[PDB]
DNA sequence: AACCCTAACCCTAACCCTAACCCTAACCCTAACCCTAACCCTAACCCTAACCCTAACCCTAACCCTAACCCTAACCCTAACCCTAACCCT
DNA sequence: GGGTTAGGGTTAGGGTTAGGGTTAGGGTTAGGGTTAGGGTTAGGGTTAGGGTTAGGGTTAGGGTTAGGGTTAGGGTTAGGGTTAGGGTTA
């Protein structure tokens, strides 16, 4: 049984964390699944070109942090950058 | 006789507050099948595929009609003209 | 006796009162007369393009069944990332 | 011992480099494997497109009394086409110009007749 | 100083083959060089996605032939397909 | 005495049959430098970069003016209005 | 960084011949301000994109290649300068 | 159709030249009156591309310079 | 140093936009009156009738010359030859 | 093998001295039926009608080929060109 | 069911043994590269603007079969009368 | 902003591998910077000629009326076409 | 995903006439253009000097990879918390 990859458990956990006594519907799960895979190939796709343009081939944390300000607008880009910096700091502080 | 001007807005609000399909399924399926037969014979269709096609066509038609109305209402005219659709398509870059 | 394929009256599948309520969703109050033909022609051209793209895709995959995933991929290649059906 | 093999472009009947595309497609991180006949098709397509573009540019330059292909000639030859204008529609060429397209309404259709001092 | 890759000799040979006593200018060479690299990442970029969508990873002659009808319009697509087929036939023959 | 209606077409044809620059270089360079200083100080500019910027701006302005004229001439008006530019930007999806 | 005398860099007779290339015969009055504002917004967007690109490359010189790449990412594949 | 072409030639009436210019312009009108000959109406200004001057330009079979 | 090789293209734009008669209204009546003298003598031509025969012949030569130019332009030629006039008359069904 | 220049004339004389049909009947009937279906459905065909249609088409094709050959042989060329057919159609007034 | 060959002859059949055989009757000796392709296209209009006349004639008499008596009146309008098969 | 009677789909546990997240050592491969020197960005100025700035005269152009008539606005008897379960297969 | 047999009720498709919406005609009185004139301000040479651009050994702090354990993670399964319609009340 070759099951298909889908983002359901993490989406439900995030929804329960940001809104109690809530949930997802039928088509809403597929909409969110198609939305995640769409931005997954957009942010990661620009990092490869940005690394190739500088004669490099290493996509680290800065390659993803800089790609936030290109795809995301203004306030959302700064918020995502701050969240990513806090996450990488908590990761480097303790393994 | 009372003056019209309220049934149109009521129908607009009723159709905007609802998410029901307006175009049929079997005629659209027959149309896309006839279109596909012009390129290669022995072709079939599914349900989700024609549903996505109908949704995309409805969205495109809604956007085109909204653009046509916004172009016509700016020229001191409450109605639209057949040339306004071609004008919007030329501005958007659909036919050049 | 027992055959018959397809015709062409399906092209005139768009009526006149049914398209009135369709344009009312966007914000159109009054239409015209030649709109019933211009919109039909534009829809036919766009559908021919999308059907040709889906046929090329299903020929790349060597399949004869136009699935929803191929239609979604063709719409995304044209510039319309449709959600809901597929993945 | 052994023989002296020639280049790969001479054995295919084309002038575009075949080994260059095969090496550029792999280094671009596009695919982990490149086919044998894959760069030949792309090279032939690119060569045909370049030949058509150069032929259109020469045909457009042969009427302007200038045997040198200037960017204005390329801009006039690309925009004056049906199958080539749709490919590079959103592509702008530097050091070029705009095709002369004057509307019929801007033409001087005034005519000093009729519109005179009263009616004779 | 590390030389830079540019399509100049092949472009000049093609121009001389399709039009004698002709040549390229200064900015026209850079325009053609930027035009070649633009379509180089467009046709080859779609083949990778088309191969990944079918759970494959082999970009052969059919992957490039099918990508012609997607990028090129109508008559130009058929002409490019015919040219590519004749080229692959001359390659497989000898 | 020539009646008005011919000098405009003559100037249009003369400017369309020529490929000369219309905007200056030093004012545009100072403008883009002042714009770059709003984000990060200690920034410089080149010649080909500002040339490509001027070419792109000239192409965008030509396209916008052509769209505005084509929108204004279809309403029985030979002149354009300040709202026509916003209308074209709203139709094209720039706002 | 100069005083606010460069934003008004677009005059009035010089923009008349600029619109004449496309096919405009008569303009108006508020166009000199609306076009300036639109050009300022578009230039701010392109400059922000180029700054983000040169910050990814850790460079302080806005080259023509970065501008061409930003224009292609926005949807304007400019030819001529760069590669 | 002939009335719109009269305004381009700075005229308020339809002359027999404008009739010939408007009839030989549309495809539905030229195919209907193909064998129809007009009197004082002239012909349509049509110049071939091969009849353009220079064309070859520079030199083709020169000797010295 | 100006006449040999000029005005060849500076004279087409005049007659192409003019409605006047190229053949002059004087040498034409004697050419028609002498032809009809052989079929049946004792004849006469009207004033308005001699102009219709002149306009009919002045328009037929234009089409014949256009066909001759189109036939000569195909063989990589810029001038028409006497062998090209007989060629255009053999396809339209004139002499054979 | 035969030297090229005599088999062609022999075949020409053999096909000119005979009055046999060259095009088939069923494919032509299917073609004219498909053409008639484009205007109005539920249409039939007879035998004498399609025979007269085939005869008229053969006569028109023979005349067009003869005109094309006579136009091509007058330009010092033994072969015909695809533009010669359009030239003959423009001279004859077929459009 | 129905046969998959619903192409209804996509203007084919008349190929090398037919076009060459028809050109050999007139006086054509050799054939270049192209020559064909458009040879099957120039015959499409000859049946497009002739059979339509017969259909329109049969529609006037409230009939449905294009007999030989109606195919001669359509060709007479263009200027190509045929004797024998018509009558 | 009846919220209710209807009422199935959003609903908290739970659960069995479980398949990916983490660990743990090796490496190994991926950025400054200090000499440097070369050519391109920028800094004062002269001229003088096309280019640009500022009134007068007037001939078309857009707008606000006036009457006017033909198309798109709103039921009514239908009764044909669009759904709504329920299996059944190829 | 197609293809069947009931059915039946909401949706689609035939007149109709009356009310306001483009269209057609006449100055109209405010609204851009230009050619005569002048006073520029941008289009070109000469430098030259500092302020950036542009290659090259050399690490050590930035990474990459073959091995387990294992916390976190992925298809099913109830019974309950508001969600859709139907008469009331408003």
The label of the residue with tokens 């709109």 reads C35
DSSP F17: S
Contact B37 K6 (CB under 8 A): yes
**CA torsion D62→D66→D67→D71, rounded to 10°?**
-90
CA distance B36 to C54: 9
Q: Classify residue J37 as exposed, middle or buried by CB count within 10 Å of its CB (0-12, 13-18, 19+).
A: middle
Cα separations in angstroms, D53 against D60, F32, G77, I61: 11, 36, 18, 41
Q: Do I70 and J83 touch (CB under 8 A)?
A: no
CA distance E12 to E29: 9
Burial profile B42-57: b = 16 or more Cβ within 10 angstroms, e = fewer: ebebbeebbbbbbbbb
Cα–Cα distance measured from residue D72 to residue D57, given in angstroms and rounded to the nearest whole number: 9
Distance F94 CA to M52 C1' (A): 38
Domain boundaries, position B21: 12-95
Tokens of E19: 């039009």
Which subunits count as partners of chain I given 3+ CB pairs below 8 Å? H, J
The 3-class SS string of C63-74 reads CCEECHHHHHHH
Residues with CB under 7 A from strand L: A 21-26, 56-58, 95; B 4, 7-8, 21, 24-27; C 20, 30-33; D 109-110, 112, 115-116; F 3, 26, 29, 44-47, 76-78; G 11, 13-14, 58
Contact assignment for I78 to H51 by CB distance below 8 Å? yes
User: Position of tokens 């766009």?
Assistant: C46
**Contact list, I69 vs chain H (CB under 8 Å):** 48
| Nucleotide nearest the Cα atom of D116 (by C1') | L59
**Chain Cα centroid distance, residue A24:** 20
Side-chain-facing half-sphere of F47: CA atoms under 13 Å = 0
User: Phi first, then psi: what are they for C6, rounded to 5°?
Assistant: -130, 160
User: Structural domain tally of chain F?
Assistant: 1
The tokens describing F57, both together, are 């701006």
Instruction: Find all residues with CB under 8 Å of E46, minimum gap 6, and list them.
Output: E67, E70, E71
**Chain B residue closest in CA terms to C30:** B79
E-only strand ranges, K15-84: 65-66
3-state secondary structure C18-51: HHHHHHHCCCCCCCCCCHHHHHHHHHHHHHHHHH
Decide: G21 and F62 in contact? Cβ < 8 Å.
Answer: yes
**Among D11, D41, D14, D13, which residue's Cα sits nearest to residue D25?**
D41
- d(C-alpha B43, C-alpha K10), whole Å: 18
Q: Check: CB of residue I78 under 8 Å from CB of residue I84.
A: no
Pick out the nucleotide with least CA–C1' distance to C30. Answer: L72
Q: How far does Cα K28 stand from its chain's mean position?
A: 21
Domain with C44 in it: what CATH number? 1.10.20.10
User: What is the Cα–Cα distance from A8 to C24, expressed in whole angstroms?
Assistant: 37
In 3D, which of E84, K13, C83 has the Cα closest to residue J26?
Answer: K13
| C-K contacts (CB, under 8 Å) | 4
DSSP label of A24: -
Query: Mind spelling out the 3-state secondary structure of chain G?
Result: CCCCCCHHHCCCHHHHHHHHCCCCCECCCCHHHHHHHHHHHHHHHHHHHHHHHHHHCCCCEECHHHHHHHHHHHCCEEECCCC
Strands (E), chain J: 44-45
Instruction: Dig out the tokens for A88 from the structure.
Output: 């990488």
Nucleotides in chain M near protein beta carbons (<7 Å) = 1-2, 12-13, 18-22, 32-35, 42-43, 52-55, 62-64, 73-75, 81-82
Of all nucleotides, the one whose C1′ comes closest to residue A58's CA is M63
Residue with tokens 């790349």: C60
Q: Is K9 left (phi over 0), alpha (psi -120 to 50) or beta?
A: left
Do H5 and H18 form a contact (C-beta atoms < 8 A)?
yes
Residues 11-70 of F with CB under 7 A from strand M: 24, 44, 46
SS3 for B81? coil
Residue C11 tokens read as: 């092209």
In chain H, residues with a C-beta closer than 8 Å to the C-beta of I15 are 42
Q: What is the SS3 assignment for D56?
A: helix
What secondary structure letter does DSSP report for B66? Answer: H
Give CA F21 to chain center in angstroms: 12
Tell me how far the alpha carbon of residue F24 is from its chain's centroid: 13
What are the chain D neighbours of B93 within 8 Å (beta carbons)? 89-90
Closest CA to F86 of I45, B70, E54, C7: B70
Dist CA D38 CA E92 (whole Å): 13
Distance CA E69, CA E65 (A): 8
CA within 13 Å, CB half, K41: 10
- Technique behind the model: cryo-EM
Q: Find all residues with CB under 8 Å of C51, minimum gap 6, and list them.
A: B32, B35, B36, B39
Closest CA to H37 of I85, I63, J89, I29: I63
Query: Could you tell me the two tokens for E39?
Result: 């379509």
Measured at the alpha carbon of residue B77, what is the angle toward residues B75 and B83, in degrees to the nearest 5? 75
Nearest residue to B69 (alpha-carbon basis) of C22, A31, K22, J39? C22
Q: For chain E, report the end-to-end CA distance as a whole number of angstroms.
A: 40
What is the count of residue pairs from E and G with beta carbons less than 8 Å apart?
18
Is B2 within the bounds of a domain? no
SS3 (DSSP) at H46? coil
Closest CA to F56 of F26, F90, F32: F32
Q: How close A93 comes to chain C (CA, Å)?
A: 37
Q: Structure tokens of A20?
A: 């109690």
Taking the Cβ of residue K8 and every Cβ of chain B, the question of whether any pair is shorter than 8 Å is answered with no
Whole-angstrom Cα Rg for chain H: 19
In DSSP terms, which residues pair with F79 in a beta bridge? G26
**For A6 and M77, how far is CA from C1' in angstroms?**
20
G65/L34 CA-to-C1' distance in Å: 29
Q: Establish whether the CB of E1 is closer than 7 Å to any nucleic acid atom in strand M.
A: yes
Q: Does D23 touch chain E (CB under 8 A)?
A: no
How many contacts, defined by CB atoms under 8 Å, are there between D and G? 28
The tokens describing B38, both together, are: 């012009």
Q: Extract the tokens encoding A13.
A: 């956990």
D31-46 in b/e form (b: 16+ CB < 10 A) is beebbebbbbbbbbbb
Nearest one of G14, G39, G29 to F31, comparing CA atoms: G39
Residue with tokens 């995304």: C76
Q: Give the DSSP letter of residue F44.
A: E
F46 closest-nt by C1' vs CA? L41
**Region of K57 on the Ramachandran plot (φ > 0 left; ψ -120 to 50 alpha; else beta):** alpha
The separation, in Å, between residue G13 CA and nucleotide L54 C1' comes to 14
Ramachandran bin of J42, using left for φ above 0, alpha for ψ from -120 to 50, beta for the remaining angles: left
Task: For residue B28, give Cα distances in angstroms to A38, B63, E62, I66.
Answer: 28, 20, 32, 52
Residue C44 CA to residue A5 CA, distance in Å, equals: 37
Measured torsion, CA atoms of residues A13, A17, A20, A22, in degrees rounded to the nearest 10: -40
* E41, E20 Cβ separation under 8 angstroms: no
Across all strands, nucleotide nearest E2 (CA–C1') = M55
CB K27 within 8 A of CB J63: no
Q: D1-107 falls under which CATH superfamily?
A: Histone, subunit A (1.10.20.10)
Q: How far is CA J4 from CA D78, E62, J16, K58, in A?
A: 46, 41, 20, 52
Interchain contact F6–D (C-beta under 8 A): yes
Q: Rounded to whole angstroms, how far apart are CA atoms B64 and B82?
A: 12
Query: Which residues in chain B are closer than 8 Å to F94, comparing Cβ atoms?
Result: none
HEC string for D12-35 = CCCCCCHHHHHHHHHHCCCCCCCC
From the centroid of its chain, how far is CA B75? 23
Please, which residues have CB within 8 angstroms of residue G36's CB and are 6 or more apart in sequence? G7, G8, G10
Nearest CA in chain H to I69: H48
Query: Could B37 and K4 be called an inter-chain contact, meaning their C-beta atoms sit closer than 8 Å?
Result: no
Neighbour subunits, J (≥3 Cβ pairs < 8 A): I, K
Chains C and D touch (3+ CB pairs under 8 A): no
C-alpha of A58 from chain center: 19
**CA–CA gap between residue K69 and residue K54 (Å, rounded):** 10
d(CA D40, CA D51): 16
Task: Assess whether G6 (CB) lies less than 7 A from strand M.
Answer: no
Q: What are φ and ψ of residue F65, in 5° steps?
A: -65, -40
The bridge status of strand J44-45 relative to strand K65-66 is: parallel
> Taking a C-beta distance cutoff of 8 angstroms, is the pair F79, G26 a contact?
yes
Q: What angle do CA D46, D51, D55 make, to 5 degrees?
A: 150
> In the block, which residue shows the tokens 């098969």?
K85
Q: E77-81 long-range contacts, Cβ below 8 Å, gap at least 24?
A: E79/D48, E80/D44, E80/D45, E80/D48, E80/D49
CB J36, CB K65: distance < 8 Å: no
> Tokens in use for F52?
């490509």
Domain ranges of chain D: 1-107
Residue K25's φ and ψ, nearest 5 degrees, are -75, -35
Sequence-separated (6 or more) residues with CB below 8 Å from residue K51 = J32, J35, J36, J53, K66, K74
Close Cβ partners of B3 (under 8 Å, ≥ 6 residues apart): none
CATH classification of the domain holding F26: 1.10.20.10
Nearest to B83 by CA among F74, I58, C30, E61: F74
Q: Reduce the DSSP state of residue E50 to 3 states and report it.
A: helix
- B26-37 and B48-72 are packed helices; what angle lies between their axes, rounded to 10 degrees? 100
C-beta within 7 A of nucleic chain M, residues 57-86 of B: 77-79
Nearest nucleotide to A16, CA against C1' atoms: L12
Q: Does G47 touch chain A (CB under 8 A)?
A: no
* Residue G46 near residue G70 (C-beta atoms within 8 A): yes
CA D105/CA D98 separation, integer angstroms: 19
CA-nearest of I80, F15, E31, F50 to F7 is F15
Q: Are F48 and G81 in contact (CB under 8 A)?
A: yes
Judge whether F88 is closer than 8 Å to chain B, CB to CB: yes
CA-CA distance, J25 to J73, in Å (whole number)? 33
Maximum CA pair distance of chain K?
Answer: 49
Cα separation, K65 vs K62, whole angstroms: 10
CA/C1' separation B19–L83 (Å): 17
Chain K touched by C3 (CB under 8 Å)? yes
CA–CA gap between residue D60 and residue G13 (Å, rounded): 34
Does J86 map to a domain?
yes
Task: For residue C80, give the nearest of C58, C43, C50 by alpha carbon.
Answer: C50
C30 touches strand M (CB under 7 A): yes
DSSP-assigned beta bridge partners for residue G78: D92
**Closest Cα partner for C65 from B47, E54, E57?**
B47
Q: Which chains pack against C, by 3+ Cβ pairs within 8 A?
A: A, B, E, K
Residues of K in contact with J35 (CB under 8 A): 44, 47-48, 51
**Total structural domains within chain A:** 1
Q: Other CB atoms closer than 10 Å to residue F12's CB: what's the count?
A: 21
| Nearest residue by alpha-carbon distance to C1' of L52 | G13
d(CA H26, CA H28): 6
Task: Quickly tell me which residue has 């020559």 as its tokens.
Answer: K35
Residues in Cβ contact with H48 at an 8 Å cutoff, skipping those fewer than 6 apart: I69, I73
Residue in J closest to K84 by C-alpha: J52
- The nucleotides of chain L lying under 7 Å from a protein CB are 9-12, 22-23, 30-32, 40-42, 52-53, 59-63, 71-74, 81-83
CA B46 from chain centre, in angstroms, equals: 22
| Residue J45, strand partner residues | K66
Of the candidates D106, D78, D75, which has an alpha carbon nearest to the alpha carbon of residue F11?
D106
**Range(s) of the domain holding residue K67:** 4-87
- In angstroms, the CA G26 to CA F8 distance is 9
Which chain B residues are closer than 8 Å to K7 by Cβ? 41
Q: Give dist(CA B28, CA B37) in Å, integer.
A: 14
CA B25 vs CA B45, B47, C49, C54, I41: distances in Å:
12, 9, 20, 19, 84
Lookup: tokens for D19? 């080994």
Which nucleotide's C1' is closest to A7 (Cα)?
M74
Taken in order E12, E15, E19, E24, the sign of the CA dihedral is negative
Distance CA J76, CA J87 (A): 17
Q: Which nucleotide is nearest to G63 (CA to C1')?
A: M53
Distance in angstroms (rounded) separating the CA atoms of residues C19 and C15: 6
- The whole-number Å distance from B52's CA to M87's C1' is 39
Beta strands in B1-96 (DSSP E): 44-45
Specify if F55 maps to a domain.
yes
Give the distance, in angstroms, between the CA of residue C44 and the centroid of all CA atoms in the same chain: 7
């Amino acid at each position: 049984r070759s099951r298909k990859e889908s983002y359901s458990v993490y989406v439900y956990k995030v929804l329960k964390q940001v809104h109690p006594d809530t949930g997802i519907s039928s088509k809403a799960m597929g909409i969110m699944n198609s939305f995640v895979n769409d931005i997954f190939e957009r942010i990661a796709g620009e990092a490869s070109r940005l690394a190739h343009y500088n004669k490099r081939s290493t996509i680290t944390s800065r390659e993803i942090q800089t790609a936030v300000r290109l795809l995301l607008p203004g306030e959302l880009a700064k918020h995502a950058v701050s969240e990513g910096t806090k996450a990488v700091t908590k990761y480097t502080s303790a393994k | 006789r009372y003056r019209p001007g309220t049934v149109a807005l009521r129908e607009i609000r009723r159709y905007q507050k609802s998410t029901e399909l307006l175009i049929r399924k079997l005629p659209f399926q027959r149309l896309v099948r006839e279109i596909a037969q012009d390129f290669k014979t022995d072709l079939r269709f599914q349900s989700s595929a024609v549903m996505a096609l109908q949704e995309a066509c409805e969205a495109y038609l809604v956007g085109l009609f909204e653009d046509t109305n916004l172009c016509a209402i700016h020229a001191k005219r409450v109605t639209i003209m057949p040339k306004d659709i071609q004008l919007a398509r030329r501005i958007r870059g659909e036919r050049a | 006796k027992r055959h018959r394929k397809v015709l062409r009256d399906n092209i005139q599948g768009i009526t006149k009162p049914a398209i009135r309520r369709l344009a009312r969703r966007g914000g159109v109050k009054r239409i015209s007369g030649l709109i019933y033909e211009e919109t039909r022609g534009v829809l036919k051209v766009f559908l021919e393009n999308v059907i040709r793209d889906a046929v090329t895709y299903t020929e790349h995959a060597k399949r004869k069944t136009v699935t929803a995933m191929d239609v979604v991929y063709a719409l995304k290649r044209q510039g319309r990332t449709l959600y809901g059906f597929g993945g | 011992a052994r023989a002296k093999a020639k280049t790969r472009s001479s054995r295919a009947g084309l002038q575009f480099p075949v080994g260059r595309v095969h090496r550029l497609l792999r280094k671009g991180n596009y695919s982990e494997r490149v086919g044998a006949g894959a760069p030949v098709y792309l090279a032939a397509v690119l060569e045909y497109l370049t030949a058509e573009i150069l032929e259109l540019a020469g045909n457009a330059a042969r009427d302007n009394k200038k045997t040198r292909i200037i960017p204005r000639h390329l801009q006039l030859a690309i925009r004056n086409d049906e199958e080539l204008n749709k490919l590079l529609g959103r592509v702008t060429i530097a050091q070029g110009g705009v095709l002369p397209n004057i509307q019929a309404v801007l033409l001087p259709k005034k005519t000093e007749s009729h519109h005179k001092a009263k009616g004779k």
